[PDB]
Amino acid sequence: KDLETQSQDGTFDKLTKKEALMRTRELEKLENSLGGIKDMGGLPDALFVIDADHEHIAIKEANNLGIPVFAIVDTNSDPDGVDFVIPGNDDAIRAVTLYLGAVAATVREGRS
Amino acid sequence: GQKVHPNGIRLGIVKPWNSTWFANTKEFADNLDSDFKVRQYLTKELAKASVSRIVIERPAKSIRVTIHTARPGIVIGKKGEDVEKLRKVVADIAGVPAQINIAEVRKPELDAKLVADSITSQLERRVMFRRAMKRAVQNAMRLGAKGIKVEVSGRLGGAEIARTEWYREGRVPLHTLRADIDYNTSEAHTTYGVIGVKVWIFKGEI
RNA sequence: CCCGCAGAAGAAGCACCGGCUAACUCCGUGCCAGCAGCCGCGGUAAUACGGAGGGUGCAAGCGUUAAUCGGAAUUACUGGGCGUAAAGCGCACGCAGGCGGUUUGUUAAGUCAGAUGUGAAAUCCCCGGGCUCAACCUGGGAACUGCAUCUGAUACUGGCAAGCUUGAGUCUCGUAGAGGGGGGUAGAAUUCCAGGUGUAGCGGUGAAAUGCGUAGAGAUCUGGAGGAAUACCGGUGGCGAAGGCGGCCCCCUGGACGAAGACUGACGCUCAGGUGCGAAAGCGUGGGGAGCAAACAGGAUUAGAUACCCUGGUAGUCCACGCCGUAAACGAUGUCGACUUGGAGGUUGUGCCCUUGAGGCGUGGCUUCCGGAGCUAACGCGUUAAGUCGACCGCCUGGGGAGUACGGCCGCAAGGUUAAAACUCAAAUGAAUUGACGGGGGCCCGCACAAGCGGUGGAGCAUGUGGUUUAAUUCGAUGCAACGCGAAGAACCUUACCUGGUCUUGACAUCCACGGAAGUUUUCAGAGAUGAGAAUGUGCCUUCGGGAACCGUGAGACAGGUGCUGCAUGGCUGUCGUCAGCUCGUGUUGUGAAAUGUUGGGUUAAGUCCCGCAACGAGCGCAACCCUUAUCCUUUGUUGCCAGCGGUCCGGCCGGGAACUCAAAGGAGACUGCCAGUGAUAAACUGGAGGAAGGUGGGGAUGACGUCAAGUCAUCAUGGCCCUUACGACCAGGGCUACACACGUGCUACAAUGGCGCAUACAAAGAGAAGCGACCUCGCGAGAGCAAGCGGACCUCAUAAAGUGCGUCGUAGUCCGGAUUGGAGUCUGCAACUCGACUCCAUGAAGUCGGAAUCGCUAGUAAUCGUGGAUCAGAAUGCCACGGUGAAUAC
């Protein structure tokens, strides 16, 4: 957050472009990692996960906490780490498009 | 052992000297004895006064005693009586008039010399060292110090075999000359021989 | 039993106190005395030994010993185990024994219910009662866990009878196979024998030797003789109970498994004793004997080599018939049966769809690997289980003694099988974890080796050390990381050591009582310390019964100790190592010690940087920040400088000038910043441009967590213990420098790129006031006299040396080398003998490039020349800085 300020309006030339670049590429590092989560600042209450193969890591962690999870599990996935299982494809490109939008609408209205 | 005195290495660059004056090569010797002598005396009288460092400046044969202290009340006594009492002998040791000038310290627990005294103080009164030692460390963080490090050695806790247990909280970059590190040392005379205390403070950064 | 009397008067020890285990300190003694159930305590600071105090436990008893049980689920019926900790017979068949599918009837043995007879009293238990309560005595009941009889019950097990078929078994048609025994047989090769060809080696090894060979080998060709084993195929492929089993063909023969049904009708599973089979080696009788090969021999290797290596070689290994009966005979896993997710394979049958095309769809037998649940100490096992259960059998009960002795049995023998005890110890042992280490593997670095240059070790001298000697040769350092070290400098001093002479509240500090200014001056005895006087002065404030001072005497606390232990310690230091590593927070996996992060791919000087990722971060380190050096601009212009301009004894010397040198401050500049290429479009690496300087530009400073219980108690500080008319203090002389001897670190040499004489050229840095000292005079000289200037860019120390031109000696122990020695001397210091440096004349040794061995060095470095400084009166070839000259090589 601080750097996000330091980047668009903050310090960018105080020392030298070479290291000013350092913070920028560092900003990129935190970017791809905590980009779309920075505003949360607490603990979530639902984990919607696309694949259970690559992301069993988080599922177990979420399961370890008092939190429910929703996984689009696949033939080679362990449903026993999930709460509300969703069988079907996970890795198919078009598959998620159908999936997320369906979730997108339900979550869009779900604040009623 | 292995490390250089933190104070000494940063003298020329950051930390100023303590006996600031001038003298040609001839008289150099005598001043050292004299300047040292008063320093010994102040330790002997203002011990129960929490005195951190004592500046000894000598412009035009005028022995100036600037004392960076903690408790002015104890130092001045009443209306300054104690100070002007000290004025007499000090002027006598240095052989010339002495304007004794005090300097109160901002935070008594942020000066290395003073804190080391506290660690020594409790060990000079049967205090379990770990509690005594750690108490100071929490204080540095509780006073905002960027970092602190402490270290004791000897027959600590009455033990026969001597061991050296240190502690650390906060960033203490000793290899960075740019940063000011108030380092100081004190002894600890217990029935179990002498205990030595060392304390570092990453007070300054530049 | 009750009553009266008398004064709290008669009436509490024992063990323990480190932990287990409640309860602590001090002193004494020091691996002695001792203690103790165990682990363990005692080494000069003991909570564990002895005493004292306090205290914890129990109580007229309290500790010790012994003995039974408990804890010991370490004999497991309740209630254990056997893959690797102790423990599956080597495998198998199989009598007794144990257990046994399913349907129905039947009987009522075992089992169950009830009743009955009995199960001695006491004891125990339950509720009561009686002795002041209790112990104790005692009433009634329960119980006596059992056994016998009688009558009912009939599920489960047993006996009997009759079946059923899903267990087991038989037959028919086929299949694969190193299944077993017997009889023939094929080719390659080795060895030997007989010739032909042909000639100095062959063979063997790390090298070599023994050995074979000019009587002619080896090599090569042809013929023959034999013995043993079966290349390729060949496959965590197949068969077998196990051991095992391998070219091909034939004979006799076992077993396994499959399709489809037929048939018998529980005929089973296991199995003590018993019987059989059972690798290799070994044994007996008779054959065979190529190759290989115990034993043995020779030859090497080696300190030795009864071995590892080489040349040969007997028994044996091969066949026949008997014996032996053991293997890490091992998936270290008994046999049989049932049930419980999956995946990839191999192999052998067989039904079906298309064989429509090396196929697709299913069902069986054996076998390989990976892993789920679960199990397990963990490793791992995992439908072929160590998972969940059932039947039966073997076996274990700490290690060692010992799978041994004794005896039995068996054996031709060697031995085998069965199988202890006394005694001894407090562990043994398994799995896994962190490290350390490997004459283990991979990756990388360093004057680590290599490529070179120059050195030490041989000589002389200097200095240090060991040893020796001595009255004393002070004490410490004493693998690397002690040995030109503490000591940045011993004649007296220093000085701690010795002899002799002296004082002992002292050399020094504070408080007390009293007297005396302090101090200066002078003399005697003494080695000196000091002992003895003689004089002078009699000074600051007046409580003036005294200050404050410095000195003297006496008393008492003490002062003092370079006395011991750096293994009681702080502080300070070296080294591993300027090596790039060392860790923590939170989380996460693991029963846990811990691991992860810190690993992996690239990269770098570097856990430096990027990417990857159950890790995300962070700290300490690396780097940078600091100083110096390489370039420039700006500013100032002395005691520093001299270009463009004048005067000159052409000396920056005098005006004058502020350019330049230089000096001193402030900044600029260098950061992979730019280009091309490679590389993951990443980090980074290679080359180039410009630039004074190029990949942290050179150098220095900087020393992580910790290691060596490394150095230091003698620089200092300091706990203990010790001396204290002494180990403390003063003094003169000596010693620390002694010298059959050994080692270290250096300087000078051994010469001609060299010596000597004459002239001459080019530095930087630093020091200087009881200090340096020109100029001038004297001397051959070290120095002496007088002595401006300078406490300092001016003055002085102070004339740079190598080098350069010329002359010259001409390979000698010399015109080299310079020790040693005599004499004459100067300076310093009270003092130069033990024991100073330097000069002059004379003297003139060892030594001609140094054994085994071994050190430093990657560029202005090695080497080589000279210079200055700290210590200090005097006393450098040491140490610390400076500048000149200027290499070699890095595959």
Swiss-Prot record, chain A:
The chain holds residues 115 to 226 of 241 of the full protein. The modification N6-succinyllysine is found at residue 1. It comes from the Bacteria. Belongs to the universal ribosomal protein uS2 family. It comes from Escherichia coli (strain K12). Required for ribosomal protein bS1 (rpsA) to bind to the 30S subunit. Part of the 30S ribosomal subunit, contacts bS1. Some nascent polypeptide chains are able to cross-link to this protein in situ. In collided ribosomes contacts ribosome rescue factor SmrB. This is Small ribosomal subunit protein uS2.
UniProtKB/Swiss-Prot annotation, chain B:
It comes from the Bacteria. GO terms for biological process: cytoplasmic translation; ribosomal small subunit assembly. The keyword NADP does not apply. Disulfide bonds: none annotated. It holds the Pfam family KH_2. Residues 38-106 form the KH type-2 domain. NCBIfam families: rpsC_bact (TIGR01009). Belongs to the universal ribosomal protein uS3 family. This is Small ribosomal subunit protein uS3. It comes from Escherichia coli (strain K12). The lineage of its organism: Bacteria, Pseudomonadati, Pseudomonadota, Gammaproteobacteria, Enterobacterales. The gene is rpsC.
